[PDB]
Design a protein around this ligand. Structure first.
Ligand code: HEC
Ligand code: MSS
Lengths: 373, 81
């Protein structure tokens, strides 16, 4: 019954209700792809489980799982292959926790100009949660990684409807996989993983785009070569340059797999055409990056002619959303508000949006017109 | 017992049109995924975009769609969406 319209062409979407979820923006049904209403991001720094976005590639998602029977298999170039129950993971290994943003490669694709094919998302394919589980490092150490290992592949319970369609399998470098931060998450915000967020176990890859965060994770293979599965070799490629970008309409000459997040920020308490009271106007929002730390968030009320430094909220960790607040004097009339974040290694946001064929990695300085009266 | 998850009923449908590619699309394009994938693509993208989408389904994802149907479908899509 209920619909919303996202602020780009062909933006109409159903509001849809899934078990364990509040109403969310329905993108596709088979498999489910659900985007989070932008308003949620102003409700607090941690995205609630019932609001968290959902993205899947293949229709054959699991719809019945016996948690007692579930096993995580660790195999390949390891001294001792492992078959681990959820009880084993919880009891036999120390637990780690991290507050980390998960964000889709193509979050904000709907705003890319010229428009490109793929998932037509507004900014709601991101969320921040407190993940708990076992560092992958500990499980791989138990198995015993062999010298010459180069990569680790990750596969889950989901599958293609037609077996010829490539299986969803991702890979990380061995040094990345064993870094101690890559996590086998069994808990999200103090609860078992919501079904569509990968019950009962998923990979969490802090500071990397969501494609690596394999859900319903049951198969881990240590390999002595580069993995050339479709979803690494062909999908999720970005231009192999600093801007990860090309001239509108042009293919890159060389590509690499998508990897770390770029710096993003948003004003969360106002939206286009919002009314504010002329005078001191309180603004707030979020910012995040690939895990280097947000150094500053600057705010403008004159379309970037001048900037005021926001006060950063106390942090929840380097991979988390970082809240910020600013109070700006707005004269009566229209004002174009902008926020721009920089991190501890000098990464920032461009004033003008760039482009790539897949519409990945958007991070342009966000503009929001408000009316002061 | 195991745990289970209940998905709501699928309701996504293609936009009707008199072109024969409408029925071909109904018969070939819902087998792997819901048709909301098509309904939500950017609007008025034109012939080359839809030609590429259809070809990708066939060559990359192995949609069992013959040459005549592939053209009817691409043509229907470029005219309708
Ligand atoms: C199984 C062999 C498929 C059939 C039959 C068709 N398509 Fe498909 N499609 C398939 C996959 C694995 C995906 C990616 C899904 C994901 O979430 O990543 C898609 C996606 C699309 C899209 C979205 C745009 C894109 O990613 O290219 C569109 C617009 C689309 N498919 C259209 C489409 C049409 C027109 C088909 C009949 C000719 C069709 N699909 C059939 C796999 C399969
Ligand atoms: N198994 C699996 N996993 C998985 C998948 C699929 O499909 N499957 N997807 C991806 C992606 S792609 Mo793009 O880059 S983002 C993303 C993510 C999401 O998450 P959530 O759903 O939970 O939100 O997931 C991840 N994981």
């Amino acid at each position: 019954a209920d619909t919303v319209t996202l602020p780009f062409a062909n933006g109409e979407r159903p509001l849809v209700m899934y078990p364990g979820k509040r109403p969310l923006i329905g993108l596709t049904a088979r498999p489910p792809q659900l985007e989070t209403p932008f308003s949620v991001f102003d409700e607090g720094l941690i995205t609630p489980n019932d609001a968290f976005f959902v993205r899947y590639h293949l229709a054959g998602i699991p719809l019945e799982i016996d948690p007692d029977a579930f096993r995580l298999e660790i195999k390949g170039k390891v001294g001792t292959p492992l078959s681990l129950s959820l009880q084993d993971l919880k009891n036999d290994f120390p637990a780690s926790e991290v507050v980390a943003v998960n964000q889709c490669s193509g979050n904000s694709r709907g705003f890319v100009e010229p428009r490109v094919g793929g998932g037509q998302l507004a900014n709601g394919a991101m969320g921040n949660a407190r993940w708990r589980g076992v560092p992958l490092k500990a499980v791989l150490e138990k198995a015993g990684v062999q010298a010459g290992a180069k990569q680790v592949t990750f596969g889950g319970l989901d599958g293609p409807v037609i077996p010829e369609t490539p299986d969803f399998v991702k890979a990380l470098s061995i040094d990345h996989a064993t870094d101690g931060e890559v996590m086998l998450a069994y808990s999200m915000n103090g609860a078992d993983l919501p079904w569509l967020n990968g019950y009962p176990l998923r990979l969490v890859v802090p500071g990397y785009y969501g494609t690596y965060w394999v859900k319903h994770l049951n198969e881990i293979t240590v390999i002595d070569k580069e993995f050339d599965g479709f979803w690494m070799k062909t999908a999720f490629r970005i231009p192999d340059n600093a801007c990860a970008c090309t001239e509108p309409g042009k293919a890159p000459t060389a590509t690499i797999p998508i990897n770390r997040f770029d710096v993003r920020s948003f004003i969360t308490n106002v939206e286009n055409g919002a009314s504010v009271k002329a005078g001191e106007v309180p603004l707030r929002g979020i910012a995040f990056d690939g895990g280097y730390g947000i150094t500053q968030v600057s705010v403008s009320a004159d379309a970037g002619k001048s900037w005021t430094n926001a006060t950063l909220d106390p942090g929840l960790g380097k991979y988390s959303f970082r809240g910020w607040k600013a109070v700006l004097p707005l004269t009566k009339g229209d004002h174009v508000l902008m926020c721009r974040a920089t991190n501890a290694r000098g990464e920032t946001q461009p004033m003008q949006a760039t482009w790539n064929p897949a519409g990945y990695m958007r991070n342009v300085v966000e503009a929001t017109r408000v009316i002061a009266a | 017992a195991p745990l289970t998850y209940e998905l709501p009923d699928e309701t996504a449908q293609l936009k009707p049109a008199p072109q024969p590619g409408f029925e071909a699309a109904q018969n070939n394009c819902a087998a792997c995924h819901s048709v909301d994938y098509i309904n939500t693509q950017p609007p008025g993208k034109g012939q080359a975009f839809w030609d590429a989408e259809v070809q990708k389904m066939i060559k990359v994802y192995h949609a069992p769609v013959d040459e005549a149907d592939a053209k009817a479908i691409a043509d229907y899509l470029a005219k309708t969406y």
